């Protein structure tokens, strides 16, 4: 509201500076030099000031190790078509193969669209920070009945994750971690300097801790973070890779009983911060690129992870994210999905398949609007199933691709409505064909080692409900070097993923499911064209017929109840079940598809179902016949052939 002159002594000279506010306050309408002057206790005796300084925890272990920042966003590709997130117009970008990049400045304007108070007026922060009001995004969550809270408020420059505990009395314990470039850190209030609060530093970045000596002691009873390592991972990793790291932890922890009743331990609280880092690293990289362009492929990969990461944190924790969605990117992605033929997506390059599937989820989030995305995911699994050697464990590259495309399918199963059943049932049938004894063995090996092989497996989305604990124990790795418990825990986790009940993402979308009497006795479902088979130990299945394979004098039963056209019957067929006709007049050499559309099951009399194959093309059939799949030496093994006509047949021998 006036001018002020500021005199000071420099090396013995009476220098003075004039700071105007009429001009400055006009040039930055958000500035209020009165609320800050009133915040700064300018008339505070040194006693009160020094007393405030000793309250705040200081980092005695003041050091950090040198770290190398990776190259996250790449240089603009040759002749990229610079899009504007605000001026998003159709036909700028032509196909998936056309080089594209989104400019950074207005793209950041959409990410950090919202604005609010970053730093609360709470008692621990009031001592250290000036009140701040900036464009921001935040990740928030609460556990223990809202008695333990966390909020990852962040900008394009720095992240601040704040823990707060309520101790069943009125007391509130607070501990906040600040991450970002040192120079861009918020403004400190009193005698404080960041080096006294730094827990890890390297180059331009730093990790600052802000808490009371008392509060630091309280948190140390259950929360001993590795501030050194968390800093290294937050710097040395790329935005996409870091977000996936956090994604695996939560996913592999959600299938377990880890996030149904979360505990206040170091591991859980550590991840809470890593989640905030995951989002910050994306917005930070876009904001730190300045007035340039960000390759579109980078956005597709990075924002796909956050989209998936946003869903996992929703089913485990009640977390919310506000401010990491640029509609301009969502639109631009949607426009490009009108370019691709979803029916033949799998015929594209694996590179462009993953590129397209990423834009699909980012372009069409919150599924239930464009159900054609499943056709694209189904086309990828089918094209991949025809080229994959039967009964083998999925390769690292194929598993990754299917994982990307599997998120769209997963969301539809959440919904109680069918959502274009046919293609959805086909995806699950192919998935059921891929879940062999070796696949399960590879998933469990990946769960016991926390590697990527456990993150996703087509078996999760399969129509196979015969996988019990003792049945998985048989297919688990028997290596003595692997931790016996990690394997025993893998089974508990694996099995926990395919619980039909309290999962909601396995069944009740097919129309042949309501024709069953007892759900827990179902073993496997094969939805074919114009028919779906209900393999179960349940005699009372309201189908068209009822076949009974020769089981044994042991386990419950094996029935095959074909449901024609997915329409139940008034009641279960009466009389002794039919006999499976055997076939010997059938040669091993075939030059045409004569088994397209059928399913070939291989079960053991005692052990039950072992392998499943869906003959989808000539390549699949030739792999069955030519290979050593048909082994009749074992009398307790049989091979059932399920036809689209509704018939079941046993292959007993070949020419």
């Amino acid at each position, epitope marked *: 509201l006036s001018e002020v002159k500021l005199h000071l002594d420099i090396e013995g000279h009476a220098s003075h500076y004039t700071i105007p506010w009429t001009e400055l306050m006009a040039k930055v309408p958000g500035l209020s030099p009165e609320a800050l002057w009133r915040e700064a206790n300018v008339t505070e005796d040194l006693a009160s000031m020094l007393n405030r300084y000793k309250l705040i925890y200081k980092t005695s272990g003041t050091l950090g190790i040198a770290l190398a920042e990776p190259v996250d966003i790449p240089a603009v590709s040759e002749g990229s078509m610079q899009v504007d997130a605000s001026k998003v117009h159709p036909g700028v970008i032509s196909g998936l193969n056309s080089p594209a990049c989104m400019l950074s400045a207005p793209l950041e304007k959409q990410l950090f669209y919202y604005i609010g108070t970053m730093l609360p007026n709470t008692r621990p922060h009031s001592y250290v920070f000036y009140q701040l009001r900036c464009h921001l995004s935040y990740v928030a969550l609460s556990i223990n009945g809202d008695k333990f809270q966390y909020t990852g408020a962040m900008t394009s420059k720095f992240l601040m994750g704040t823990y707060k505990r309520v101790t069943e009395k009125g007391d509130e314990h607070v501990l906040s971690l600040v991450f970002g470039k040192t120079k861009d850190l918020p403004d400190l209030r009193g005698p404080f300097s960041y080096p006294s609060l730094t827990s890890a530093q390297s180059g331009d970045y730093s990790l600052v801790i802000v808490t009371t000596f008392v509060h630091y002691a309280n948190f140390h009873n259950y929360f001993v973070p590795n501030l050194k390592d968390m800093f290294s991972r937050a710097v040395t990793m790329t935005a996409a890779s870091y977000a996936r790291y956090v994604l695996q932890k939560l996913v592999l922890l959600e299938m377990k009983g880890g996030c149904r009743e979360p505990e206040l*331990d170091t*591991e859980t609280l550590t991840t809470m911060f890593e989640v905030s880092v995951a989002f910050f690293k994306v917005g930070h990289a876009v904001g730190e690129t300045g007035n340039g362009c960000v390759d579109l492929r980078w956005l597709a990969k990075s924002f796909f992870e956050l989209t998936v990461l946003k869903d996992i944190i929703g089913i485990c924790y009640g977390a919310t994210v506000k401010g990491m969605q640029s509609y301009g990117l969502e639109r631009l992605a949607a426009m490009l999905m009108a370019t691709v033929k979803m029916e033949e997506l799998g015929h594209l390059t694996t590179e462009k398949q993953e590129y397209a599937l990423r834009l699909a989820t980012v372009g069409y989030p919150k599924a239930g609007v464009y159900s054609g995305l499943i056709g694209g995911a189904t086309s990828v699994l089918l094209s991949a199933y025809n080229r994959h050697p039967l009964f083998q464990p999925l390769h690292t590259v194929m598993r990754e691709t299917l994982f990307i495309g599997s998120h769209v399918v997963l969301r539809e199963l959440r919904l109680n409505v069918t959502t274009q059943g046919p293609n959805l049932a086909l995806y699950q049938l192919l998935s059921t064909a891929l879940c062999s004894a070796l696949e399960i063995g590879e998933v469990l090996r990946g769960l016991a080692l926390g590697t990527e092989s456990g993150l996703f497996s087509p078996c999760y989305l399969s129509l196979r409900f015969d996988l019990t604990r003792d049945k998985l124990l048989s297919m688990a790795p028997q290596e003595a070097t692997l931790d016996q418990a*990690a394997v025993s825990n893998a089974v508990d986790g694996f099995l926990g993923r395919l619980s039909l009940e309290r999962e909601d993402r396995d069944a009740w979308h097919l129309p042949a499911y309501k024709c069953v009497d007892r759900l827990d006795k179902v073993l496997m479902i094969i939805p074919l064209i114009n028919v779906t088979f209900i393999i179960s130990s349940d005699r009372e299945v309201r189908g068209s017929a009822l076949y009974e394979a020769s089981t044994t004098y042991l386990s419950s039963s094996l029935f095959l109840s074909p449901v024609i056209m997915n329409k139940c019957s008034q009641g279960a067929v009466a009389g002794e079940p039919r006999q499976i006709p055997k076939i010997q007049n059938f040669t091993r050499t075939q030059k045409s598809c004569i088994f397209c559309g059928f399913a070939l099951l291989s079960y053991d009399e005692k052990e039950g179902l072992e392998t499943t194959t869906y003959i989808t093309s000539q390549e699949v059939q030739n792999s069955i016949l030519s290979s050593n799949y048909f082994d009749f030496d074992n009398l307790h093994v049989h091979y059932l052939l399920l036809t689209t006509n509704g018939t079941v047949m046993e292959i007993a021998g070949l020419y």
Partner: antibody
Amino acid sequence: EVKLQQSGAELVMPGASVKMSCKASGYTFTDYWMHWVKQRPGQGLEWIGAIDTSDSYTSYNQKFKGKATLTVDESSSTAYMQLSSLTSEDSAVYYCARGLLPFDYWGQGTTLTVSS
Amino acid sequence: DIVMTQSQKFMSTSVGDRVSVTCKASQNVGTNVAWYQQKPGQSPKALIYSASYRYSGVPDRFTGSGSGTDFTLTISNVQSEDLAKYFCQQYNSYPYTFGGGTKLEIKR
């Protein structure tokens, strides 16, 4: 001088319940959690649970959910653990340990015997 | 639950040698590992914290090393008084779980 003194032994009939106190001295009892550990003769150490002093925030995080019941009294600076429906398998040494994360100090141990 | 695997239940060494107790975690545990010494007829006593930091009053003969999955307790200059069982503990995620114990024998 931090001390966690524990009663030498406790003999209780099967099916009944036991007291198992742990009196702390030499420090501010309320500024550190209290953890309980179970050890059978010659075997390993099983972590029963933990309780936050001055808040009574109870955290039983293992298979002793229905066995253990941790309580605290600030006046006497004591931390307790109650076993319910005692069985022969529960007869073992029970340590009370001060929690700085890790366990700074350990009590002398309370041997629990269940026979009649 | 996480299991702390101490494979070697017994280890015998001379008086002037060094010994290395191995602790293998079923998951990534970070630097949150503790080692306790339980001499016969005694309660365990805290030896090292954070998997490498030595408690006050314990001699410089004990040192810790490791991070993530493989942890080792380094006892350099053994003496007759070191006979005891050595446990490793993880306190990074509930439930806090201990190792199987490693009995240190002495030859003479």
